[PDB]
Amino acid sequence: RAEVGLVWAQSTSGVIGRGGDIPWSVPEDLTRFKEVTMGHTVIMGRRTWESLPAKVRPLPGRRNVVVSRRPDFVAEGARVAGSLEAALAYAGSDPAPWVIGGAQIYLLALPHATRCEVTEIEIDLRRDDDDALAPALDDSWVGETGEWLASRSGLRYRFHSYRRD
Ligand SMILES: NC(=O)C1=CN([C@@H]2O[C@H](COP(=O)(O)OP(=O)(O)OC[C@H]3O[C@@H](n4cnc5c(N)ncnc54)[C@H](OP(=O)(O)O)[C@@H]3O)[C@@H](O)[C@H]2O)C=CC1
Ligand SMILES: COc1cc(Cc2cnc(N)nc2N)cc(OC)c1OC
Numbered sequence: 001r002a003e004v005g006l007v008w009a010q011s012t013s014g015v016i017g018r019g020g021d022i023p024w025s026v027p028e029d030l031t032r033f034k035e036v037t038m039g040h041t042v043i044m045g046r047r048t049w050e051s052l053p054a055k056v057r058p059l060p061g062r063r064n065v066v067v068s069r070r071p072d073f074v075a076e077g078a079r080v081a082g083s084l085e086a087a088l089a090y091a092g093s094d095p096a097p098w099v100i101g102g103a104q105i106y107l108l109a110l111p112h113a114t115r116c117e118v119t120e121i122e123i124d125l126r127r128d129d130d131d132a133l134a135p136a137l138d139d140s141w142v143g144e145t146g147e148w149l150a151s152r153s154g155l156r157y158r159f160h161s162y163r164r165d
Helices: 027-037 046-051 084-090 103-112
Strands: 005-011 015-017 041-045 063-067 079-081 115-122 142-145 156-163
Touching (some): 005 027, 005 103, 027 115, 027 156, 041 084, 063 084, 084 103
Parallel strands (some): 063 079
Antiparallel strands (some): 005 015, 115 156
């Protein structure tokens, strides 16, 4: 088995996206994200692809895979996959492909997943109807939660690192 991983950043309340963007500034999260995903396949939903600045995509040093129901969708510098099953196939021999968002794609991949790396951001965001939300993890997941750390931005964050099987 490839060890299928999910990686995301959420507010304590579970928001991951608002108005198409990440609704906070925590540089340290992007560092952790890169440190987690470098050298691996990164699988993402079409909307997440379009949320990435055009100048920042595809993510360098990683095989980019975009999931869309449209067989003719084009993602320059990425492979387009018609299902999470097809995306995982494209990861080939990668021992640890990572699913990197967003909300709909996390729900799709969750049944396949054996690792989650979650950054929690201490910011008071009240869930709105149009927010993208993190999936809820049940207690079949085990691992560790680090201490709260001060970001350069003045917010606190911490890492959660879970596995199952
Ligand atoms: N805080 C964080 O860690 C992160 C936050 N984000 C945020 O999350 C938000 C995006 O999340 P979300 O809106 O849910 O969108 P997603 O990024 O999950 O992509 C949704 C798209 O995936 C495709 N898709 C969904 N299900 C299937 C399926 N079963 N088979 C084939 N294709 C499928 C569809 O594309 P199509 O319509 O083209 O067919 C759909 O529109 C953005 O705001 C982004 O900024 C993103 C990544 C990380
Ligand atoms: C490298 O920059 C981005 C990375 C991500 C995805 C992402 C970001 N952080 C974490 N912890 N997990 C993720 N999947 C999402 C982004 O925007 C939606 C990014 O652009 C700022």
